[PDB]
C-alpha cells in the first residue's frame, strides 16, 4: 500500500517571495509533517502516508526546499538550517497549524531536531529516522569532525559547487538505481571519493534494479530531479559552518517534548551507535530499532517503520 | 480578518482525468468544506475562513467546478448535480477524509443538500445559506416551476449557451460591481430579463462600488473569471431536468444528520419563506436568520454569519 501521485492532494504554500513549498496531504486528525532526506522526495514516504492516515493522522509529506515541485533557488545560503526551519514555521502559520508532529529522515532528520530545539512551541512531538541529535561541539570545527571520520569523505566532495552536480545529473536513471539499494546490494564505498574521481567511478554503468524499488519508482525520481537537478539538494551540505554557528546558540537547552529516535542496523553512514548518548539530553527519549535495514529506511523496512511510528504516535 | 490569496495554502485534487478542483485550506480540527455559489469564488468565504479556523476547524474553501483555478470543461452535462456531487466524494477520498461538514451558499447550498441526501455517510453535518431544501415534485417539471415564479425569469435567460456569457463577459468589472451589492443598493431588474434583451441593459454603465466591497476585492473576481469565463459557472443552471430526474430517485427519504438553514431577510430570489416546511423532511434542523441581509450573505453580514455557524458547529 503506497501512493499514486495523481491520486493525491497537492498543496502549495508561498513561505516567501521567491519560495513556495509543495506537499502532499492525506488523512484527518493531528497533523504529522514528514521530511525526507537527500536525495529523495515526498514520494520516499509512499508507504507511511497511507498507513499513518489510516491510523487516524493528518499527513503532510513535504518536498523539502530544492526538491521536486518546491522552489530551488541557486543560492547556497538558502539551505542552511536556520533559514529552512524559519520557512517550516512560516509554512505552519499559513496553513493555520499551531503545532505539528515532525518526522524526518536523513537531512530531514536533522531539520526536525533543529525545529525541536529552536521552535519547541510549534512541534508537538519529534521523531528522526537514522539521524541522531548530536549537540554542537563549540571547539571542534565542523570541517574537523569529518577529516576525523573516514566515511564522511563524500561530504567534502559535495562542497565544491558544480562537481557533484555534474556527476549526479549525468545519468539520472543510473544515479537513483545506484543509490537506492539495500545495504547488501550496495555498489558504493564512501571511503575514497575525493581522490578516486567521483562517487560512481568504480560502480557499474548499467546497474541492476534493487529489490526495494520498481523501475516505475525510479522513473518518478528521475522526472522529479529533471526540473531542478542536484544543486539545491546538495546545497544542504554546504552550510556546515553556518549550521554549527547557529547550533551553538542552543548549546544549553533541552528537548522536553516527546521524542523518538529510530536506528537502522545497516546504515553504514548514520550508524546506530552515533545516537547512544541521546538520553543524556532527552531523558524521556523513546527508541525503535530496525534489523537488516540500510540507509533508505522507509523503502527498506516500511512495515516495521509504520509499526514503530504508529505505536509511538498513539502513545506520545 | 479576511484573506490574502498568496498567504493561503492552495490544494489541487484531480477527481477525473481532466477535472482538477482547487481549494484553499486553513486550520486544524474537523474538516469543513465551504462551497460558494454563482458567480463567486473560494474568496467569497474570506470572512469565514479565518474565523472558523480560529474557532478550531479545518477549513477547505473550494473553487467549485467551473470557477477560478478549478477545471472548467465546456460540456453542460459536466455541471449537473449528480456529477458535481460524485466529484466532491472523490475529492474526500483523495484527501483521505471519511467525513466533512459541508457548508454551502446559493448553488453551493443546493449541492450540499444533495450531498446530505445521497451521501449522508460522508457528510458529518450540513448547513446552507439562503438556499432551501425543497424536495423534488415528480408531477411538475422544473420549467413549470420557473413560469409560476417570475422572479426566476433570469434563469431562462441563462439557458441558451453563449447568450448570458456575452453580456456577463463584456465588461467584468461592471458585471461584478453590478452584482455584488447590498439589497438597498440594487440596480438589477430580475423580473424582465428576456424582454429587455440583457440583465444589465437598464442599469448604469459605470456603477459605484457597493459599501460591501473594495475595488481590490472586485478586481480579484475579475482576474479569476478571465481564466475560464462564464460558460462553466452558467452551466450550473442548464441541468434542471437532469437534476430533477436525479432528485426524484431519493423517493422521499429524509435527511437525518445535523442540519442548519440560515435565511436572509433581504434576499429577494432565495426568500426566507421558501424554507418554511423543511422540518418535515429534516427532523434535526436548526435555524439561523439574518436581518438586513441580502443575497451575498458572507460579505453583507460576515460577523452574524460567523457567530451562527460557529455556535452551531460547536454544539452539533
Author numbering:
A (entry chain A), B (entry chain B): 230 to 545
Quoted from the paper:
Human soluble epoxide hydrolase (hsEH) is a cytosolic enzyme which modulates the metabolism of bioactive epoxy fatty acids (EpFAs), by converting them into their corresponding vicinal diols. In mammals, the enzyme is composed of two structurally distinct domains connected by a proline-rich linker. Whilst the N-terminal domain exerts phosphatase activity on glycerophospoholipids and lysophosphatidic acids, the hydrolytic activity on EpFAs resides in the C-terminal domain (CTD). This hydrolysis involves a SN2 nucleophilic attack by D335 on the least hindered carbon atom of the epoxide, followed by water-mediated release of the alkyl-enzyme intermediate, assisted by D496 and H524.
First, we solved the structure of apo hsEH CTD by X-ray crystallography, and our results were found to be in excellent agreement with previously deposited structures of the full-length enzyme, with an RMSD of 0.257 Å on all CTD heavy atoms. The apoprotein crystallised in space group I2, with two hsEH CTD molecules in the asymmetric unit forming a homodimer. Superposition of the apo and holo crystal structures gave an RMSD on all heavy atoms of 0.198 Å, indicating a high similarity of the two structures. Minor changes were observed in two regions proximal to the F267 Pocket.
